[PDB]
Design a protein around this ligand. Structure first.
Ligand SMILES: *[C@@H]1O[C@H](CO)[C@@H](O)[C@H](O)[C@H]1NC(C)=O
Ligand SMILES: *[C@@H]1O[C@H](CO)[C@@H](O)[C@H](O)[C@H]1NC(C)=O
Ligand SMILES: *[C@@H]1O[C@H](CO)[C@@H](O)[C@H](O)[C@H]1NC(C)=O
Ligand SMILES: *[C@@H]1O[C@H](CO)[C@@H](O)[C@H](O)[C@H]1NC(C)=O
Ligand SMILES: *[C@@H]1O[C@H](CO)[C@@H](O)[C@H](O)[C@H]1NC(C)=O
Ligand SMILES: *[C@@H]1O[C@H](CO)[C@@H](O)[C@H](O)[C@H]1NC(C)=O
Ligand SMILES: *[C@@H]1O[C@H](CO)[C@@H](O)[C@H](O)[C@H]1NC(C)=O
Ligand SMILES: *[C@@H]1O[C@H](CO)[C@@H](O)[C@H](O)[C@H]1NC(C)=O
Ligand SMILES: *[C@@H]1O[C@H](CO)[C@@H](O)[C@H](O)[C@H]1NC(C)=O
Ligand SMILES: *[C@@H]1O[C@H](CO)[C@@H](O)[C@H](O)[C@H]1NC(C)=O
Ligand SMILES: *[C@@H]1O[C@H](CO)[C@@H](O)[C@H](O)[C@H]1NC(C)=O
Ligand SMILES: *[C@@H]1O[C@H](CO)[C@@H](O)[C@H](O)[C@H]1NC(C)=O
Lengths: 564, 98, 60, 96, 49, 36
């Protein structure tokens, strides 16, 4: 809103050092020359954004201070600065916000409770043009000022003005936004911003900054910083380099997800009991765990020693799966370090089990009228079961000392008993279909399907093929690859050709455009115009344009006539 | 000249005491607080490789300049005119050079 | 009695907490009557939930 | 006492100065070794020290006196020995 | 070792320059007469061995 | 017609040969299986 052009103002002494008749380049927060500056003539809140440049118009005294802080409310302490032409008050107290704060004076004072830091100082100072630069770095708040009587009050006068530091304050809290203060009894001021921009400063005999240039504004000023001079002679100078960044970052992988069915172990009609749990080997097949997360059917999908997110990018071999029937009430027994009846005599999970347990209700299929007496379990055992062991035996328990000779008695206690799963059983007694997956680390582990991002051509695009990755432009290739190659290296171990196995079509790979940018000038005093030269780059993506055998240059017109 | 550029490329593949010869792997599977340790031994090795190439390049540049000056001298005498000095341009009494 | 988790466990169940290696937790009463082999411990945010008994080890 | 930036401590030592002697100096923040002498250059009221080329400090304004002084490294270099030959003679002349 | 090779090259280069100068003196001042003045011995050079 | 890869527990034979599949001494406790 009502932007204005800051021609040259926005410079300050970067430090308290003295330099005489020497040009020094400093990297610090600065306001770029000819940068748009917000103008208000009206007093809304403005963000800080790591440095604020302020400039008040002449013939005015409405501005009397600024308020800095993070929230300017009762939550966080905020910095308050007020000047009454005779003293400056610096409060870091707990002050509330105001709809339209102003000054009759001292109206901005909302709340002074819980004052943390207190500081008081003396005031600093056709009429004077006030310029101020405010920054907060390393917990120190620095104040700069300079009054220059000038004309053309409507806009910012041209010329030069070096801002000097006055006060250092150790505030130490983060500041994100501020608010100017006006006295009601409309003034015009400009608000700028600073960023880590590099300038070159010129020091005279008296060590006063008389002029400066920006190192990223225009090619002419680009050369000055690297040459450490203001008057670059007639010639060609290389100032910096350039390249092209990746855009899409595609990835290609093998025709995939075709392998490894799990319905035969997850959705099979028949499952074994807990006393006869099966252990089928699962290896060298591509398992997709994502579909399990959104199944919306599991009830005890718990992972031990692994997280659902991190088991896809990395995976382990030895994917033995155990399937058995467990009643709802005793599902919790199946866990590492968990003991009980089923966990002790039927299926014991060893400690540090890097796997997950998946269970879901099976009322509609794993139940029948009159009781499903088809699933059995081991109720008694002489000794605790070793973890990951299946004990298929008809030996009966020995409660007392009298041996049992196969005839059941008062101390034989035939361990094998059949479960009862009626359709009307309670939720706790419902038979929940449960499977267990174990993972441990044989080489060549097999994981889930990859990204398969769609490709792109004739663009500097990052690529991460199977095992190999790089950044370069992808284009068609006339070369022929034998059926047992995935990529090719031109010379000196440099990949230049990769065949995407999905499409089965060899493609050339080349690094995208880069090199050193050069500036052509006829002399600082002779003229001002300059031309930018790019070396060995197809002149279609660099930014009068003329293409030459040494790349294309901008700022010159081709002439058929030949001169010296 | 060709091998001098060529030999530089292989230096990128040199480990220089680091577990990997590529920057991406170092930045991927190393803890950043200690990742720079492997980088530092790699930058020094790569910087050393570049130093040799430039220093070696300068040695040849001086030799070429000496050859160029000698060629210019032969241009000055044995092309632009007749070289009275004996056995300076072709064995025998010199007449001219093309 | 502070307890240290030796590894990372994932929980789907709304009754349960998320912990990682090195997390500090406070032990609660041993009234394990809701389910066998289930322990309750506090987390950094204070939320309470059932966690595996073997997921924790006695500190020393 | 607990640790806002810019902590403030006990008063500084502020010892006296010496001129025209290779002497270590430790001003408020900066320190070094060199000879201190009068200077003709003038500092603006907001500088503390000055440097000329390649980050070489040469002028320091002592806060205690608010006066500007020149700083130069004291004499050093290589000492050479002049001899006429071991057999010719024995006396030698030192060269600085 | 880096310094030794680099120093050796510098010495090798100037020796080669000296060798070329020596070869030049052979061509003019030995195989013939050097009309150029003060190139081989002070005074009007006749020949050399 | 096919190639069978058994990493199973196979005993040694005095003169194994193939009528075929005579070399099959023991296939108990199969660890890894692969067919191509
Ligand atoms: C500055 O603002 C004017 C008007 O809003 C606009 O035309 C111009 O493009 C802006 N320039 C920059 C560099 O923001
Ligand atoms: C003041 O604010 C601090 C913020 O940390 C708080 O600890 C303290 O209790 C507060 N005291 C009063 C009197 O509001
Ligand atoms: C400022 O922000 C940083 C960024 O994380 C934070 O660490 C620090 O605690 C913040 N300090 C204040 C006073 O807001
Ligand atoms: C330096 O200051 C002196 C007096 O303070 C003045 O006479 C002289 O003109 C000034 N020179 C420059 C280049 O500012
Ligand atoms: C099993 O069937 C359910 C219901 O159709 C389905 O959501 C799930 O993906 C299936 N799982 C497998 C491994 O077939
Ligand atoms: C696999 O090849 C078929 C054959 O045309 C193709 O339709 C399909 O898109 C390919 N799949 C992938 C993932 O590339
Ligand atoms: C620019 O400066 C050069 C160098 O002194 C001089 O030869 C030339 O005439 C000057 N041109 C103008 C327009 O001042
Ligand atoms: C630059 O690229 C365009 C295609 O974008 C091509 O037509 C043109 O021939 C290229 N120029 C050179 C010099 O290769
Ligand atoms: C210069 O040469 C180009 C190429 O032949 C031609 O098209 C053009 O008409 C000529 N004249 C000018 C003024 O460019
Ligand atoms: C310090 O300031 C006081 C102020 O009166 C002055 O008298 C004294 O001379 C000053 N110290 C020095 C070393 O000049
Ligand atoms: C010293 O030795 C040199 C070298 O042999 C010789 O020229 C000179 O005459 C000798 N002087 C005396 C006094 O022996
Ligand atoms: C099969 O061999 C493994 C080898 O570790 C052994 O642990 C297991 O008990 C064996 N099982 C049978 C039935 O032979």
């Amino acid at each position: 809103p009502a932007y204005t052009n800051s021609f040259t103002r926005g410079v300050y002494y970067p430090d308290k050092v003295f330099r005489s008749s020497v040009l020094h380049s400093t990297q610090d927060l600065f306001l770029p020359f000819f940068s748009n500056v917000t103008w208000f003539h009206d007093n809304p809140v403005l963000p800080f954004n790591d440095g604020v440049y302020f400039a008040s118009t002449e013939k005015s005294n409405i501005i009397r201070g600024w308020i800095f802080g993070t929230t300017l409310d009762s939550k966080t302490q905020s910095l308050l600065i007020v000047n009454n032409a005779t003293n400056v008050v610096i409060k870091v107290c707990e002050f509330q916000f105001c709809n339209d704060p102003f000054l009759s004076e001292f109206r901005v004072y909302s709340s002074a409770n819980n004052c943390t830091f207190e500081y008081v100082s003396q005031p600093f100072l056709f009429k004077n043009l006030r310029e101020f630069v405010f920054k907060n770095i390393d917990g120190y708040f620095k104040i700069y000022s300079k009054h220059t009587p000038i004309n053309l009050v409507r806009d910012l006068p041209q010329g030069f003005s070096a801002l000097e530091p006055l006060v250092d304050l150790p505030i130490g809290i983060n500041i994100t936004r501020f608010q100017t203060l006006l006295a009601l009894h409309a003034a015009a001021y400009y608000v700028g911003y600073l960023q880590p921009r590099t300038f070159l400063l010129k020091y005279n005999e008296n060590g006063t900054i008389t002029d400066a240039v920006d190192c990223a504004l225009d090619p002419l000023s680009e050369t000055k910083c690297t040459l450490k001079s203001f008057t670059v002679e007639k010639g060609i100078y290389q100032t910096s380099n350039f390249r092209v960044q990746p855009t899409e970052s595609i990835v290609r992988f093998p025709n995939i997800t075709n392998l490894c069915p799990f319905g035969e172990v997850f959705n099979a009609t028949r499952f074994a009991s807990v006393y006869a749990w099966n252990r089928k080997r699962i290896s060298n097949c591509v398992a997709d765990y994502s579909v399990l997360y959104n199944s919306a059917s599991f009830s005890t999908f718990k992972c031990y020693g692994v997280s659902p997110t991190k088991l896809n990018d990395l995976c382990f071999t030895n994917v033995y799966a155990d399937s058995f029937v467990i009643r709802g009430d005793e599902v919790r027994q199946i866990a590492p370090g968990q003991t009980g009846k089923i966990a002790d005599y039927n299926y014991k999970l060893p400690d540090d089990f890097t796997g997950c347990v998946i269970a879901w209700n099976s009322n509609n299929l794993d139940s029948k009228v009159g009781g499903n007496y088809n699933y059995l379990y081991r109720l008694f055992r002489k000794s605790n079961l070793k973890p990951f062991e299946r004990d298929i035996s008809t030996e009966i328990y020995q409660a007392g000392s009298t041996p049992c000779n196969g005839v059941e008695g008062f101390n034989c206690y035939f361990p094998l008993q059949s479960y009862g799963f009626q359709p009307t059983n309670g939720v706790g007694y419902q038979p929940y279909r449960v499977v267990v997956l174990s993972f441990e680390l044989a080489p060549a582990t097999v994981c889930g399907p990859k990204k398969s991002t769609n490709l792109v051509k004739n663009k500097c695009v990052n690529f991460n093929f199977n095992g190999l990755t790089g950044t370069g432009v992808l284009t068609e290739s006339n070369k022929k690859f034998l059926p047992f190659q995935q990529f090719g290296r031109d010379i000196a171990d440099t990949t230049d050709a990769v065949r995407d196995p999905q499409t089965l079509e060899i493609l050339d790979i080349t690094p995208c455009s880069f090199g050193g940018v050069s500036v052509i000038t006829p002399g600082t005093n002779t003229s001002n115009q300059v031309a930018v030269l790019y070396q060995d780059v197809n002149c279609t993506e660099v930014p009068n344009v003329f293409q030459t055998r040494a790349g294309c240059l901008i700022g010159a017109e081709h002439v058929n006539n030949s001169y010296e | 000249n060709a091998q001098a550029l060529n030999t530089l490329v292989k230096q990128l593949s040199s480990n220089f005491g680091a577990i990997s010869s590529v920057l991406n792997d170092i930045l991927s599977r190393l803890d950043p607080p200690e990742a720079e340790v492997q980088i530092d031994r790699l930058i020094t090795g790569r910087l050393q490789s570049l130093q040799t190439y430039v220093t070696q390049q300068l040695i040849r540049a001086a030799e070429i300049r000496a050859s160029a000056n000698l060629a210019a001298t032969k241009m000055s005498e044995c092309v632009l005119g007749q070289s009275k000095r004996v056995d300076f341009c072709g064995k025998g009494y010199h007449l001219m050079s093309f | 009695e502070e307890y240290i988790a030796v590894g990372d466990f994932f929980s789907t169940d709304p009754a349960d907490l998320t912990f990682k290696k090195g997390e500090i937790l406070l032990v609660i009463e041993r009234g394990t009557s809701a389910g066998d082999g289930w322990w309750i411990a506090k987390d950094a945010k204070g939320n309470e939930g059932l966690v595996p008994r073997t997921y924790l080890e006695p500190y020393s």
